[PDB]
Design a protein around this ligand. Structure first.
Ligand SMILES: NCCCCCCNS(=O)(=O)c1cccc2c(Cl)cccc12
Ligand SMILES: [Ca+2]
Length: 89
């Protein structure tokens, strides 16, 4: 079902969309399809001011990976935001 999630997707316009889509490119500016991993992860967090081990970051991808695949597609991705948004933690 996962409806309670699509409910928020309707709130998202299109201006804030181009903001995220632009991020993916970074996480995968040379990957085949666009599957993100602890590999291209620490790559973006580098521009900020962090650079932990791929073992710790996996924890962030293991929480959303509701299919155990070690990836973050534009799918389960939205969920992440919707969650932290409607409820930060
Ligand atoms: N660590 C996840 C929290 C996301 C932060 C919200 C802002 N989105 S973001 O561009 O900063 C961003 C950060 C970390 C992982 C991402 C993946 Cl796997 C896909 C797309 C964007 C990602
Ligand atoms: Ca996944």
């Amino acid at each position: 079902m996962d409806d309670i999630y699509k409910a928020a997707v309707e709130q998202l316009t299109e201006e804030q969309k181009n903001e995220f889509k632009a991020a993916f490119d970074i996480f995968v500016l040379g990957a085949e399809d666009g599957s993100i991993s602890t590999k291209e992860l620490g790559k973006v967090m580098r521009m900020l001011g962090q650079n932990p081990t791929p073992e710790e970051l996996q924890e962030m991808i293991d929480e959303v990976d509701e299919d155990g695949s070690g990836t973050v597609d534009f799918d389960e991705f939205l969920v992440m935001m919707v969650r932290s948004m409607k409820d930060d933690s």
